Amino acid sequence: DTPYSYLIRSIGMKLKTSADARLAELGLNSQQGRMIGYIYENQESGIIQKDLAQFSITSMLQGLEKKGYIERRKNIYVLPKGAALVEEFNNIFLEVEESITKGLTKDEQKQLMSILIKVNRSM
Amino acid sequence: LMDTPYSYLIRSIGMKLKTSADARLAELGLNSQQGRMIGYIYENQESGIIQKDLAQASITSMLQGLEKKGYIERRIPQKNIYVLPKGAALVEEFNNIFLEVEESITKGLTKDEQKQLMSILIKVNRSM
Numbered sequence: 001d002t003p004y005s006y007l008i009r010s011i012g013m014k015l016k017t018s019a020d021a022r023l024a025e026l027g028l029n030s031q032q033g034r035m036i037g038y039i040y041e042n043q044e045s046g047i048i049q050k051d052l053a054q055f056s057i058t059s060m061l062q063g064l065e066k067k068g069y070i071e072r073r074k075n076i077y078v079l080p081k082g083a084a085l086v087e088e089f090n091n092i093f094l095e096v097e098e099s100i101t102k103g104l105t106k107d108e109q110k111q112l113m114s115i116l117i118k119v120n121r122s123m
Numbered sequence: 124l125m126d127t128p129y130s131y132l133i134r135s136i137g138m139k140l141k142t143s144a145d146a147r148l149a150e151l152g153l154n155s156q157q158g159r160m161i162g163y164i165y166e167n168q169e170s171g172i173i174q175k176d177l178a179q180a181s182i183t184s185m186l187q188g189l190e191k192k193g194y195i196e197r198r199i200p201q202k203n204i205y206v207l208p209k210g211a212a213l214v215e216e217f218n219n220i221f222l223e224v225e226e227s228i229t230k231g232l233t234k235d236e237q238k239q240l241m242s243i244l245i246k247v248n249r250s251m
């Protein structure tokens with residue numbers, strides 16, 4: 001009896017499947033991926049260990065250093081391997097996005113975009 | 124987040140619905156998983172529900188909590204789980220919250236847009 005909410009939740013959950021599988025193949029968790037992402041995003045501005053505590057973190061950074069994702073040290077920087085990973089995950093999300101229209105006709109593709117915009121605007 | 128436009132909107136709408144719902148439930152010291160669980164029990168109890176069927180957040184803890192608060196009981200027909208009247212009243216308040224959230228999805232849409240959205244979302248969900 002709440003079919004729109006059910007479909008929105010379920011599709012929303014499926015948007016994450018490919019990313020979770022890659023994290024697992026790489027031996028990383030969601031906290032590690034996000035941390036690498038956060039550092040990649042903010043390292044030019046400059047980020048220190050305190051900043052990551054407020055947005056252990058010591059042991060995680062050590063794990064990420066051992067995997068060659070983060071530079072050993074003071075500001076924190078991802079290594080090229082870390083930047084490459086962020087790019088990889090972005091591309092995963094692009095492939096998932098492209099899959100949304102797989103089962104849809106041209107008209108359905110346009111209508112979905114128009115309607116989702118309207119729904120999102122209304123709440 | 125806006126580099127993947129459909130995904131952006133789907134998650135934005137999802138997160139807005141969930142925030143609406145989590146907040147309206149939280150005031151009642153409830154959460155959506157408890158509501159779903161009680162609802163499932165209420166709907167299927169005459170079929171015979173055991174803890175195993177619910178397994179397939181700690182389920183044992185959540186069931187003990189619902190039982191301690193007087194919402195469900197375990198009856199000797201493995202014991203079967205049933206909603207008590209206080210729990211049936213609570214299912215209805217849960218359901219009404221979910222129904223108002225559902226209606227917020229379609230407020231701004233024509234009947235045709237509602238029909239198109241249902242049809243399309245079924246297809247998208249099937250395809251992945």
Ligand SMILES: [K+]
Nearest residue numbers: 101102103104
């Ligand atoms: K297609």
